From a paper:
In the autoinhibited state of MINDY1, sulfur-centered hydrogen bonding of the catalytic C137 with the hydroxyl of Y114 rotates C137 away from the active site. In the active conformation, this inhibitory Y114-C137 interaction is broken due to the Cys loop movement, and the side chain of Y114 now hydrogen bonds with S163. Interestingly, in the MINDY1∼Ub complex, which represents the product-bound intermediate state, Y114 is hydrogen bonded to S163 before the transition back from the activated to the inhibited state after Ub chain hydrolysis. These observations strongly imply a linchpin role for Y114 in regulating the transition from an inhibited to active state. Disruption of this single hydrogen bond with a Y114F mutation results in increased DUB activity, with an ∼30-fold increase in kcat compared to WT. (H) A close-up image of active site of apo MINDY1 Y114F mutant compared to WT. Hydrogen bonding of C137 to Y114 is broken in the mutant. In MINDY1 and MINDY2, an additional layer of regulation is imparted by a sulfur-centered hydrogen bond between a Tyr and the catalytic Cys, which further reinforces autoinhibition.
MINDY1 and MINDY2 are members of the MINDY family of deubiquitinases (DUBs) that have exquisite specificity for cleaving K48-polyUb, yet we have a poor understanding of their catalytic mechanism. Here, we analyze the crystal structures of MINDY1 and MINDY2 alone and in complex with monoUb, di-, and penta-K48-polyUb, identifying 5 distinct Ub binding sites in the catalytic domain that explain how these DUBs sense both Ub chain length and linkage type to cleave K48-polyUb chains. The activity of MINDY1/2 is inhibited by the Cys-loop, and we find that substrate interaction relieves autoinhibition to activate these DUBs. We also find that MINDY1/2 use a non-canonical catalytic triad composed of Cys-His-Thr.
Residue numbers in the entry: 109 to 180, 184 to 370
């Protein structure tokens, strides 16, 4: 109930009573997105008694998990740096992380130190925010620029003497006005296609981090919402429609219905 305390839903996962962390805040900290993936993979175990958990608790669990990862062609020297780099930006996942997306593919983002937690834990970060290839106008306008970059450029555009840069200026502005809930249809398709069937990942949209997976060839996000705390029958929520209706499922990915 209080601000760095979170509630522990217990749910029958791959045979066993498994914990999962619920947030009503729906913030921009990835800790739960990552942590939930870990509890699901059973890399972290909570005593069954357990009801609430602190940030500081999760944070410990995560640090020991990272320092516990056995090395394995991969990065050689780049591994050991990767660990130290993870360790040095580890205390920032608490306070939550700004992500600068690229519109160019579901896996592309401007690299930041926080990306090392994900990269090391074998967790992919994906996003849905892709510029469609049906509008060659806008693909070229936005181009290979980053988001925080696009806004910089849009502004230096409104002020250019070349009118063509105010054309691109207004095109790029347009795409952001239109695609502002940050999942294009194109995004969804590409991202559906792209995730490994079965594998747990982290889905970014509207400064929010979610735990994702692919199943029977569609996407589902784990239900961190706290309202559905009592309801174990409620775990996954479909991500089939870009904007529309969700069908809640039990851990076995079959339909469930709330009290």
């Amino acid at each position: 109930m209080e601000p760095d305390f979170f509630c522990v839903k217990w749910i029958p996962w791959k045979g066993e009573q498994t914990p999962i962390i619920t947030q009503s805040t729906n913030g921009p900290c990835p800790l739960l997105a990552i942590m939930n993936i870990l509890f699901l993979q059973w890399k972290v175990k909570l005593p069954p008694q357990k009801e609430v958990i602190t940030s500081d608790e999760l944070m410990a669990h995560l640090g020991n998990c990272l320092l516990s990862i056995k090395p394995q062609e991969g990065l050689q020297l780049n591994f050991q740096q990767n660990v130290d780099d993870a360790m040095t930006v580890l205390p920032k996942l608490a306070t939550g992380l700004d992500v600068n997306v690229r519109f160019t593919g579901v896996s592309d983002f401007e690299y930041t130190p926080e990306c090392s937690v994900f990269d090391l834990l074998g967790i992919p970060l994906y996003h849905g925010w892709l510029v469609d290839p049906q509008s060659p106008e806008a693909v070229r306008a936005v181009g290979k620029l980053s988001y925080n970059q696009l806004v910089e450029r849009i502004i230096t555009c409104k002020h250019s003497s070349d009118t063509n840069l105010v054309t691109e200026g207004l095109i790029a502005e347009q795409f952001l006005e239109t695609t502002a809930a940050q999942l294009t249809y194109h995004g969804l398709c590409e991202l559906t296609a792209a995730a490994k069937e079965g594998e747990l990942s982290v889905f970014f949209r509207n400064n929010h981090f979610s735990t994702m997976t692919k199943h029977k060839s569609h996407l589902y996000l784990l239900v961190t919402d706290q309202g559905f705390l009592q309801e174990e029958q409620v775990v996954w929520e479909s991500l089939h429609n870009v904007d529309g209706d969700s069908c809640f499922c039990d851990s076995d990915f079959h339909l469930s219905h709330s009290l």
